[PDB]
């Protein structure tokens with residue numbers, strides 16, 4: 001087995017017999033994924049100190065009580081994926097300390113007598129996928145402290161007040177009744193339970209009339225979390241949920257219930273709900289009175305809550321949701337917005353509208369007029385086929401912090417008036433766009449940015465003086481990768497004292513680093529953390545470009561052609577934590593180049609390089625590798641030399657340096 | 662026969678290499694430039710006696726198996742420029758160099774070592790083959806002492 005500290009785990013050993021050779025100073029034993037004839041009752045004499053046993057995923061036919069007598073200190077008893085054709089009460093008469101019983105696949109058809117007259121400390125009772133037909137588990141009052149009762153993937157036809165009366169004072173935190181073909185509910189079947197809080201009815205095929213009758217039956221109860229998923233709730237009426245008007249609910253779920261129509265006042269009898277979900281529904285439309293009465297909701301999800309003839313939302317449809325703060329409408333097909341769609345939401349702070357608009361190619365200053373009176377903090381608009389934005393689009397939303405406009409085809413000459421009205425925004429998501437032309441005043445109106453990534457935007461004309469990034473001072477993260485920049489001067493990025501993260505992947509900086517004077521990039525970047533110039537076609541590193549980068553942490557210069565390693569290139573990089581030079585054309589590793597970066601390096605990566613197995617090239621590198629604990633992944637595999645012929649295709653570590661000094 | 666830019670690299674172990682050019686005696690010029698070939702197996706240029714030109718440039722060829730060119734006794738022009746050739750061995754480029762008229766292997770990471778270029782340097786010193794840009798685009802890439810050094814100006818007195 002693994003034989004780790006204290007606990008013992010045996011993932012896969014093809015074990016067939018209970019072993020007794022392992023040390024006895026253990027408290028947990030694992031038997032998952034093993035083939036056993038039958039659990040012996042007398043072989044546990046040696047192991048009488050196990051707190052719990054993970055004896056599951058086993059082909060055990062019959063269970064004997066004597067086992068859990070030899071181990072009185074037994075807490076978790078998992079018997080899932082086992083045969084267990086039939087069980088009786090005599091297995092649990094002198095077996096009381098159980099706290100966790102798991103029966104997930106045992107094909108237990110009928111329950112006889114009272115098997116649980118002695119278990120007084122059990123909390124979770126998982127009895128599912130066993131073909132159980134009647135929810136009766138006993139006649140007398142038992143299960144004083146039972147918090148979870150799982151009954152799923154069985155064939156219960158109905159619930160009756162007499163088969164559930166055996167729970168006298170049980171306080172069930174979570175009740176599971178999923179995948180049960182329930183067709184009717186006897187009156188008073190829920191009042192016999194002491195205190196029930198949550199219920200699950202997934203894959204239970206609830207009819208709307210059956211759902212209404214269930215809601216009537218659920219009155220007087222302390223239910224707070226109710227879930228109704230995978231049903232035939234194609235429509236909802238005013239009186240459908242009226243039976244829940246006497247309950248104090250917290251969460252209501254209606255996902256995967258193909259709801260087509262929402263009646264007027266459907267949830268008007270729910271003055272205490274705080275979280276609501278309508279995921280994956282073919283809702284035709286939402287009337288303004290559909291949400292009437294929901295004055296206490298705080299989280300609404302409308303993911304895939306619309307039909308393909310296209311669905312639309314009327315104005316003033318969210319006025320009643322004055323306490324909502326998290327609205328999600330991802331993956332929908334609303335054509336466009338109106339003047340009074342979001343009007344009424346006075347507490348919305350997190351709004352997601354990803355892939356929800358189809359006819360909103362052009363954005364004006366009337367699209368987000370409804371959100372002026374709402375202090376939003378996050379706005380998601382990805383995959384919305386955004387093509388053009390007008391001035392004053394975000395003027396109303398002056399409290400925005402997180403803005404998303406990526407994964408679109410925006411094409412426009414940015415002038416800085418597109419962000420007019422934004423007071424204090426944290427970061428802007430404009431990656432993955434077809435064409436965004438920058439100007440000298442594009443970022444002047446918003447100097448409060450903290451993160452700014454422009455991946456795959458085909459940006460151009462960024463060498464214009466003054467740089468558009470000049471007004472940004474406290475910016476921390478900047479990304480201009482995958483854009484194929486033609487050229488850049490030292491004017492850009494100047495004054496970014498607070499900049500920490502910089503990425504220049506796929507930007508062809510080859511010629512920018514001797515003719516016309518080398519560009520002295522990275523001037524005074526004290527706060528820069530990680531520098532990434534991977535796959536920029538770099539061919540030669542000019543001297544004096546990594547200076548003053550004392551606080552730099554990581555360097556990634558892979559997928560390039562670097563062979564001319566100038567001496568003393570890395571002098572101030574004494575705080576480097578990870579050096580990446582994989583897939584380059586490095587031939588020799590000299591001490592004067594990689595010395596200071598190797599003083600306190602944590603991980604190194606320069607694989608796929610034509611190394612030269614010679615005393616002049618890798619002797620210092622081989623000595624350092626042999627005399628360091630730096631994490632070098634695939635050191636023995638992808639570090640083969642390319643020259644000479646004798647040492648071609650040989651591991652870098654398998655080189656003797658005792659003959660050269 | 663011209664196969665420029667066709668991605669024939671992996672065709673020369675997918676169930677055994679394909680023995681292409683099987684008994685193609687009358688072919689005169691063969692051009693397979695810029696196909697990314699990485700390894701040429703033995704017994705692929707057999708029965709090519711009348712072939713005159715081979716052009717395998719703009720590829721990545723470093724594994725030169727012995728006796729690759731055995732029937733290329735009538736080769737007139739060999740082109741291997743802009744490849745990843747590191748060493749030039751006699752047993753590989755012997756027969757093609759018997760009557761070669763023009764040779765082109767510029768822009769290659771040559772290794773200025775005794776085992777690699779000694780025979781090639783001697784051949785260059787004692788041949789009349791017309792080679793363009795021989796002293797400019799034939800600089801070695803390793804070691805550091807011989808990096809960026811002309812290939813023709815190599816002393817073989819310390820070799821053999």
Ligand SMILES: *[C@@H]1O[C@H](CO)[C@@H](O[C@@H]2O[C@H](CO)[C@@H](O[C@@H]3O[C@H](CO)[C@@H](O)[C@H](O)[C@@H]3O)[C@H](O)[C@H]2NC(C)=O)[C@H](O)[C@H]1NC(C)=O
Pocket residue numbers: 219220246
């Ligand atoms: C359990 O749920 C039932 C509903 O199924 C609740 O019944 C409701 O009980 C209240 C209080 O007894 C009734 O209000 C009363 O109405 C009479 C007129 O009939 C009025 O004179 C009283 O002043 C009082 O307002 C209410 O009508 C009744 N509703 C129904 C539909 O029966 C019951 O309160 C819940 N709790 C318990 C512990 O049963």
Ligand SMILES: *[C@@H]1O[C@H](CO)[C@@H](O[C@@H]2O[C@H](CO)[C@@H](O[C@@H]3O[C@H](CO)[C@@H](O)[C@H](O)[C@@H]3O)[C@H](O)[C@H]2NC(C)=O)[C@H](O)[C@H]1NC(C)=O
Pocket residue numbers: 330352354380381382404
């Ligand atoms: C706005 O909604 C869209 C809906 O798709 C969100 O897109 C999803 O965002 C997550 C988190 O960024 C992405 O997961 C990521 O996957 C990549 C690998 O592709 C992984 O490297 C990251 O660590 C992360 O796990 C997810 O792929 C992405 N889905 C699509 C289709 O783009 C978007 O994040 C939302 N905007 C927010 C929350 O600001």
Ligand SMILES: *[C@@H]1O[C@H](CO)[C@@H](O[C@@H]2O[C@H](CO)[C@@H](O[C@@H]3O[C@H](CO)[C@@H](O)[C@H](O)[C@@H]3O)[C@H](O)[C@H]2NC(C)=O)[C@H](O)[C@H]1NC(C)=O
Pocket residue numbers: 365366391392
């Ligand atoms: C969204 O932004 C646009 C762009 O500024 C605003 O359009 C502006 O609307 C005002 C009032 O309609 C225009 O003022 C008047 O325009 C007429 C010509 O239409 C002119 O003859 C008058 O002397 C007066 O200037 C203004 O010109 C117009 N701007 C542009 C560039 O056409 C629009 O009002 C904004 N919408 C919201 C809701 O903020």
Ligand SMILES: *[C@@H]1O[C@H](CO)[C@@H](O[C@@H]2O[C@H](CO)[C@@H](O[C@@H]3O[C@H](CO)[C@@H](O)[C@H](O)[C@@H]3O)[C@H](O)[C@H]2NC(C)=O)[C@H](O)[C@H]1NC(C)=O
Pocket residue numbers: 390391415417
């Ligand atoms: C959205 O905002 C941009 C940025 O301000 C507006 O572009 C600006 O439009 C004005 C008005 O046409 C331009 O002023 C013009 O300048 C020329 C000289 O170049 C002058 O001869 C004209 O009489 C006029 O004053 C301004 O140059 C231009 N700026 C840029 C950077 O393009 C745009 O018009 C706004 N659009 C809407 C719909 O409000």
Ligand SMILES: *[C@@H]1O[C@H](CO)[C@@H](O[C@@H]2O[C@H](CO)[C@@H](O)[C@H](O)[C@H]2NC(C)=O)[C@H](O)[C@H]1NC(C)=O
Pocket residue numbers: 197198224225250251275
């Ligand atoms: C219903 O389920 C929700 C979701 O788990 C429970 O709310 C969580 O309560 C814990 C405990 O305070 C918090 O840490 C979580 O942040 C809450 N999550 C959400 C989404 O609200 C709620 O307590 C449950 N109702 C019960 C058990 O009656």
Ligand SMILES: *[C@@H]1O[C@H](CO)[C@@H](O[C@@H]2O[C@H](CO)[C@@H](O)[C@H](O)[C@H]2NC(C)=O)[C@H](O)[C@H]1NC(C)=O
Pocket residue numbers: 245246247248271272
């Ligand atoms: C939620 O719980 C509250 C508190 O128990 C219920 O309010 C009580 O309602 C009864 C009538 O059934 C009154 O006699 C009590 O005086 C009320 N107490 C308080 C503190 O208001 C409420 O009815 C429950 N249900 C809903 C939907 O709120």
Ligand SMILES: *[C@@H]1O[C@H](CO)[C@@H](O[C@@H]2O[C@H](CO)[C@@H](O)[C@H](O)[C@H]2NC(C)=O)[C@H](O)[C@H]1NC(C)=O
Pocket residue numbers: 264287288289290316
């Ligand atoms: C549900 O209630 C809404 C009101 O919230 C009703 O919508 C109104 O319909 C009338 C008739 O055309 C219009 O004059 C009103 O302007 C509408 N209200 C709003 C806010 O626009 C709707 O008709 C009701 N539906 C049912 C089936 O009763």
Ligand SMILES: *[C@@H]1O[C@H](CO)[C@@H](O[C@@H]2O[C@H](CO)[C@@H](O)[C@H](O)[C@H]2NC(C)=O)[C@H](O)[C@H]1NC(C)=O
Pocket residue numbers: 447448449473474
């Ligand atoms: C740029 O970021 C800095 C760092 O947070 C901001 O400085 C802080 O701003 C908050 C906002 O009120 C103040 O409470 C702090 O006292 C400021 N810290 C210091 C050291 O001055 C700065 O305001 C930001 N500038 C812009 C334009 O957003």
Ligand SMILES: *[C@@H]1O[C@H](CO)[C@@H](O)[C@H](O)[C@H]1NC(C)=O
Pocket residue numbers: 016017018019040043
């Ligand atoms: C358990 O005890 C029986 C009886 O001695 C023995 O045959 C068997 O090998 C022991 N171990 C297991 C894993 O059954």
Ligand SMILES: *[C@@H]1O[C@H](CO)[C@@H](O)[C@H](O)[C@H]1NC(C)=O
Pocket residue numbers: 141142144168169
């Ligand atoms: C349940 O609670 C009632 C009332 O407090 C009490 O009379 C009864 O003994 C309790 N039963 C159990 C099994 O705790």
